[PDB]
Amino acid sequence: APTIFSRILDKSLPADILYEDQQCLVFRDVAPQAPVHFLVIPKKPIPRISQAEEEDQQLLGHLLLVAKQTAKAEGLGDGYRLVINDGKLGAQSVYHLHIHVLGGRQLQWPPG
């Protein structure tokens, strides 16, 4: 069952960790799509946003607040984009919930 994020969480795969607390971990994407590209993940292994439930409300808000404070720390004041992919049509790579945060270039429209 475990995805590659389990190695990031258990620190067996070195990552550039920007923030950690008991609920979440933030690290740089190693296949970046922007000059700044990091991932915010829960420690609870929710596989996808479609499988989050009411009990996850607080955690989901926490992930968004951590995303925006990390964006400020990474100097994304002129703007950035948050992306959550669900399933195959969403292009979800890894079946552990993650928020992409992209900045440092102009992001285009549509968003894929």
Add this chain to the structure above:
Amino acid sequence: DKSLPADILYEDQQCLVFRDVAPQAPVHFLVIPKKPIPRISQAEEEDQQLLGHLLLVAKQTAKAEGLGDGYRLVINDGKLGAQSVYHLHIHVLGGRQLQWPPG
């Protein structure tokens, strides 16, 4: 394209969900808080439960709209994010293969 009242997919005391009249996918809707948070970079700690509620509403509406094969949620901040309206919007896109990178 003038919206109709049925373009509101969901409403409660916290939020509105409405179809995008300039859709980028066969299904494209917008989740906004009723609280006037202008951009995600201006959300604060007091907004934690609201932000989680918006995400839960997004995912339940995506079920309602038939997005079981997958979808994408997008929040734009500022000029580099391509933020078009200075109120918080969660875009939900589905019904086609979304590409990578996401813009």
